[PDB]
Design an enzyme around this catalytic site. Structure first.
Site, PDB file in Angstrom:
ATOM      1  N   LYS A  75      12.171  13.498  21.869  1.00  0.00           N
ATOM      2  CA  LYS A  75      12.471  14.773  21.233  1.00  0.00           C
ATOM      3  C   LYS A  75      11.303  15.742  21.308  1.00  0.00           C
ATOM      4  O   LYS A  75      11.536  16.949  21.414  1.00  0.00           O
ATOM      5  CB  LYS A  75      12.916  14.561  19.791  1.00  0.00           C
ATOM      6  CG  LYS A  75      11.937  13.815  18.924  1.00  0.00           C
ATOM      7  CD  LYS A  75      12.569  13.686  17.478  1.00  0.00           C
ATOM      8  CE  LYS A  75      11.684  12.853  16.555  1.00  0.00           C
ATOM      9  NZ  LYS A  75      11.670  11.422  16.961  1.00  0.00           N
ATOM     10  N   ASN A  97       9.082  18.912  13.379  1.00  0.00           N
ATOM     11  CA  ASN A  97       8.369  17.644  13.434  1.00  0.00           C
ATOM     12  C   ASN A  97       7.325  17.645  14.542  1.00  0.00           C
ATOM     13  O   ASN A  97       6.343  16.924  14.436  1.00  0.00           O
ATOM     14  CB  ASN A  97       9.372  16.513  13.664  1.00  0.00           C
ATOM     15  CG  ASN A  97       8.803  15.147  13.401  1.00  0.00           C
ATOM     16  OD1 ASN A  97       8.439  14.819  12.273  1.00  0.00           O
ATOM     17  ND2 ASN A  97       8.747  14.320  14.439  1.00  0.00           N
ATOM     18  N   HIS A 138      12.082   2.909  12.539  1.00  0.00           N
ATOM     19  CA  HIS A 138      12.024   3.294  11.119  1.00  0.00           C
ATOM     20  C   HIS A 138      12.770   2.322  10.220  1.00  0.00           C
ATOM     21  O   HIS A 138      13.334   2.719   9.190  1.00  0.00           O
ATOM     22  CB  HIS A 138      12.555   4.727  10.940  1.00  0.00           C
ATOM     23  CG  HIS A 138      11.728   5.736  11.658  1.00  0.00           C
ATOM     24  ND1 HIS A 138      10.385   5.883  11.395  1.00  0.00           N
ATOM     25  CD2 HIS A 138      12.013   6.583  12.675  1.00  0.00           C
ATOM     26  CE1 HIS A 138       9.880   6.808  12.194  1.00  0.00           C
ATOM     27  NE2 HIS A 138      10.840   7.233  12.994  1.00  0.00           N
TER      28      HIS A 138
HETATM   29  C1  LIG Z   1       5.712  11.355   8.033  1.00  0.00           C
HETATM   30  C2  LIG Z   1       6.292  12.678   8.442  1.00  0.00           C
HETATM   31  O1  LIG Z   1       7.498  12.886   8.429  1.00  0.00           O
HETATM   32  N1  LIG Z   1       5.412  13.618   8.804  1.00  0.00           N
HETATM   33  C3  LIG Z   1       5.789  14.966   9.205  1.00  0.00           C
HETATM   34  C4  LIG Z   1       5.368  15.949   8.125  1.00  0.00           C
HETATM   35  O2  LIG Z   1       3.981  15.825   7.948  1.00  0.00           O
HETATM   36  P1  LIG Z   1       3.396  15.788   6.436  1.00  0.00           P
HETATM   37  O3  LIG Z   1       1.906  15.929   6.564  1.00  0.00           O
HETATM   38  O4  LIG Z   1       4.104  16.806   5.585  1.00  0.00           O
HETATM   39  O5  LIG Z   1       3.760  14.324   5.954  1.00  0.00           O
HETATM   40  P2  LIG Z   1       4.499  13.711   4.687  1.00  0.00           P
HETATM   41  O6  LIG Z   1       5.940  14.008   4.742  1.00  0.00           O
HETATM   42  O7  LIG Z   1       3.729  14.191   3.476  1.00  0.00           O
HETATM   43  O8  LIG Z   1       4.253  12.172   4.923  1.00  0.00           O
HETATM   44  C5  LIG Z   1       2.942  11.628   5.218  1.00  0.00           C
HETATM   45  C6  LIG Z   1       2.737  10.407   4.351  1.00  0.00           C
HETATM   46  O9  LIG Z   1       2.529  10.826   2.985  1.00  0.00           O
HETATM   47  C7  LIG Z   1       3.190   9.913   2.145  1.00  0.00           C
HETATM   48  N2  LIG Z   1       3.456  10.587   0.881  1.00  0.00           N
HETATM   49  C8  LIG Z   1       4.013  11.847   0.861  1.00  0.00           C
HETATM   50  C9  LIG Z   1       4.309  12.473  -0.287  1.00  0.00           C
HETATM   51  C10 LIG Z   1       4.043  11.824  -1.542  1.00  0.00           C
HETATM   52  O10 LIG Z   1       4.287  12.287  -2.648  1.00  0.00           O
HETATM   53  N3  LIG Z   1       3.486  10.568  -1.439  1.00  0.00           N
HETATM   54  C11 LIG Z   1       3.174   9.900  -0.284  1.00  0.00           C
HETATM   55  O11 LIG Z   1       2.724   8.762  -0.291  1.00  0.00           O
HETATM   56  C12 LIG Z   1       4.454   9.553   2.904  1.00  0.00           C
HETATM   57  O12 LIG Z   1       5.070   8.377   2.379  1.00  0.00           O
HETATM   58  C13 LIG Z   1       3.891   9.395   4.321  1.00  0.00           C
HETATM   59  O13 LIG Z   1       3.394   8.068   4.498  1.00  0.00           O
HETATM   60  O14 LIG Z   1       5.754  17.272   8.462  1.00  0.00           O
HETATM   61  C14 LIG Z   1       5.202  17.737   9.713  1.00  0.00           C
HETATM   62  C15 LIG Z   1       5.768  19.126   9.940  1.00  0.00           C
HETATM   63  O15 LIG Z   1       7.205  19.119   9.945  1.00  0.00           O
HETATM   64  C16 LIG Z   1       5.564  16.779  10.846  1.00  0.00           C
HETATM   65  O16 LIG Z   1       4.975  17.233  12.060  1.00  0.00           O
HETATM   66  C17 LIG Z   1       5.099  15.372  10.508  1.00  0.00           C
HETATM   67  O17 LIG Z   1       5.646  14.548  11.547  1.00  0.00           O
HETATM   68  C18 LIG Z   1       4.761  13.558  12.101  1.00  0.00           C
HETATM   69  C19 LIG Z   1       4.473  13.950  13.534  1.00  0.00           C
HETATM   70  C20 LIG Z   1       5.435  12.196  12.048  1.00  0.00           C
HETATM   71  O18 LIG Z   1       4.758  11.172  12.099  1.00  0.00           O
HETATM   72  N4  LIG Z   1       6.769  12.194  11.924  1.00  0.00           N
HETATM   73  C21 LIG Z   1       7.554  10.969  11.930  1.00  0.00           C
HETATM   74  C22 LIG Z   1       8.778  11.116  11.032  1.00  0.00           C
HETATM   75  C23 LIG Z   1       8.039  10.626  13.330  1.00  0.00           C
HETATM   76  O19 LIG Z   1       7.988  11.401  14.272  1.00  0.00           O
HETATM   77  O20 LIG Z   1       8.568   9.423  13.386  1.00  0.00           O
HETATM   78 MG   LIG Z   2      10.210   8.705  14.449  1.00  0.00          MG
END
Ligand SMILES: CC(=O)N[C@H]1[C@@H](OP(=O)(O)OP(=O)(O)OC[C@H]2O[C@@H](n3ccc(=O)[nH]c3=O)[C@H](O)[C@@H]2O)O[C@H](CO)[C@@H](O)[C@@H]1O[C@H](C)C(=O)N[C@@H](C)C(=O)O
Ligand SMILES: [Mg+2]
Length: 446
Positions: free
Chosen positions: A118, A141, A186
């Site tokens: 993707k 993402n 996942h």
């Molecule tokens: C994990 C995920 O979905 N990350 C996407 C997200 O980044 P962001 O920095 O906001 O991350 P997040 O959603 O806060 O998650 C990061 C980590 O923080 C943890 N977390 C988050 C919030 C909270 O209250 N507690 C906690 O422990 C989550 O469980 C996770 O382990 O938002 C960004 C902008 O949309 C994305 O680029 C980024 O994708 C990265 C590239 C990713 O790894 N994505 C996964 C889903 C993938 O491709 O498989």
């Molecule tokens: Mg993924």
């Protein structure tokens, strides 16, 4: 504990949480931020840039969440988190940055998910749109948070979306949507393939057109019968379809009966990249990008960093960074693709956070193509169990050691391949850091 009737809460202080803070603050809306961690990664950022925003770090207070009209939840935070379940049952809307983006965007959205490919297809469609002279914004993402893309002059949005983001998207209403492929991933978040598949198919809610992979049934949506449906695949295409036309052993990217471009004129190679090219053509054709612009961008496209990326050849051994391979399907493709390309055997580097994946599918390709496997990371032992005695297995502690040992295992003509089939998160910040540190260790070999 009074609040304004518009009160909303950002749940999770990471990169997308900060994009939500920016968005809500610019609109002057009442909101607060919470995070399950005492020291989330963007806490220092929020404290420096938004010193007036209320932030609560630690065990989520369900009574506080239940005072909000909507929660915008970080995609990395499971929606089965108890306080989120409790808020949902009290009628608080469980939302997120992509849901909010979809509700605000004023231009057609190309929406792209899938277990693999993707980012490559999103990047490619974006480059096609630039070549077509569209005012395009690309993100999700992929990296740039979608809300940070919003502008009224944007003509086309191209979003890479994860299954996690889609779980809180109520009605994306994409102009064209696709699930490129589905393979096990996942499974530390989903109970099984059914819930994972359902999450991805939320990309089709309200979709005005779809792009379907003829080679993957888990990409076929119900609405393919009621909206324009464009398909891609590697076989000869029918009407409304993208595929390959083969004549005297020469292959062409094709739309219906029209040859578009010989596959030899692409820079990217191999069946998975041909499929990606055809998926991008289908997505671009759906939103009106001219064929000549799309094909020009395809010819120029060089691929993304950490996608089977050549680093070095030393003593006749080539080194490839495929750190983007965070699931078994990706590693399978790289082992088969690079294994079939080289004048030698592979030394595979794998392991990390396996996310509960079944590694059995690696065994036969490893037996066919590998001289040895070097295993690191949390689930190295689970991978070793799945591989059995196919080839010699070397267990190491660090990525630098893995590279040094792989160099010793390899013989002239071999390739050393980092294609880990696992998330990097047990040892690294992300898979890009993993790939950069692999390339650094490779460059440090004498
Ligand atoms: C994990 C995920 O979905 N990350 C996407 C997200 O980044 P962001 O920095 O906001 O991350 P997040 O959603 O806060 O998650 C990061 C980590 O923080 C943890 N977390 C988050 C919030 C909270 O209250 N507690 C906690 O422990 C989550 O469980 C996770 O382990 O938002 C960004 C902008 O949309 C994305 O680029 C980024 O994708 C990265 C590239 C990713 O790894 N994505 C996964 C889903 C993938 O491709 O498989
Ligand atoms: Mg993924």
């Amino acid at each position: 504990h009074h609040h304004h009737h518009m009160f909303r809460i950002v749940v999770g202080l990471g990169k997308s949480g900060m994009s939500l803070v920016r968005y809500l603050a610019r609109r002057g809306l009442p909101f607060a931020v919470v995070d399950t961690r005492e020291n989330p990664p963007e806490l220092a950022t929020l404290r420096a840039q938004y010193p007036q925003v209320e932030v609560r770090c630690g065990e989520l207070d369900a009574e506080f969440l239940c005072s909000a009209r909507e929660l915008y939840v970080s995609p990395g935070l499971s929606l089965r988190t108890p306080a989120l379940v409790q808020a949902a049952a009290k009628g608080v809307r469980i939302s997120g940055d992509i849901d909010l983006f979809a509700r605000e965007a004023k231009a057609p959205i190309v929406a792209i998910t899938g277990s693999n490919a993707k980012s490559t297809v999103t990047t490619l469609v974006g480059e096609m749109a630039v070549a077509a002279d569209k005012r395009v914004a690309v993100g999700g993402n992929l990296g740039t948070p979608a809300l940070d893309l919003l502008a009224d002059d944007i003509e086309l949005y191209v979003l890479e979306l994860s299954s996690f983001q889609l779980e809180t998207c109520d009605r994306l209403n994409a102009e064209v949507a696709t699930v490129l492929n589905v393979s096990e991933d996942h499974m530390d978040r989903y109970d099984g393939m059914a819930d994972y598949h359902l999450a991805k198919h939320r990309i089709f809610r309200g979709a005005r057109q779809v792009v379907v992979n003829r080679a993957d049934a888990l990409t076929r949506p119900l609405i393919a019968d009621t909206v324009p449906c464009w398909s891609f695949g590697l076989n000869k295409p029918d009407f409304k379809a993208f595929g390959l036309i083969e004549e005297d052993g020469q292959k062409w990217l094709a739309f219906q009966f029209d040859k578009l471009l010989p596959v030899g004129e692409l820079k990217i190679r191999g069946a998975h990249n041909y499929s990606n090219a055809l998926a991008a053509l289908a997505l671009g054709h759906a939103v009106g990008l001219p064929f000549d612009a799309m094909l020009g961008a395809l010819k120029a496209f060089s691929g993304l960093a950490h996608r089977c990326q050549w680093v070095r050849e030393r003593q006749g051994v080539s080194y490839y960074d495929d750190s983007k391979a965070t699931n078994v399907g990706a590693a399978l493709a790289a082992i088969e693709g690079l294994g079939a390309d080289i004048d030698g055997k592979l030394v595979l580097l794998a392991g990390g956070d396996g996310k509960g994946a079944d590694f059995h599918d690696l065994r036969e390709p490893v037996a066919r193509f590998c001289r040895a496997v070097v295993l690191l990371g949390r689930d190295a032992g689970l991978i070793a169990q799945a591989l059995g005695n196919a080839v010699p297995l070397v267990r190491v502690a660090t990525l630098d050691e893995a590279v040094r040992q792989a160099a010793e295992l390899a013989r002239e003509g071999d390739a050393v391949l980092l294609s880990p089939a696992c998330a990097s998160l047990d040892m690294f910040k992300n898979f890009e850091e993993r790939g950069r540190l692999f390339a650094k260790a490779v460059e440090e070999l004498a």
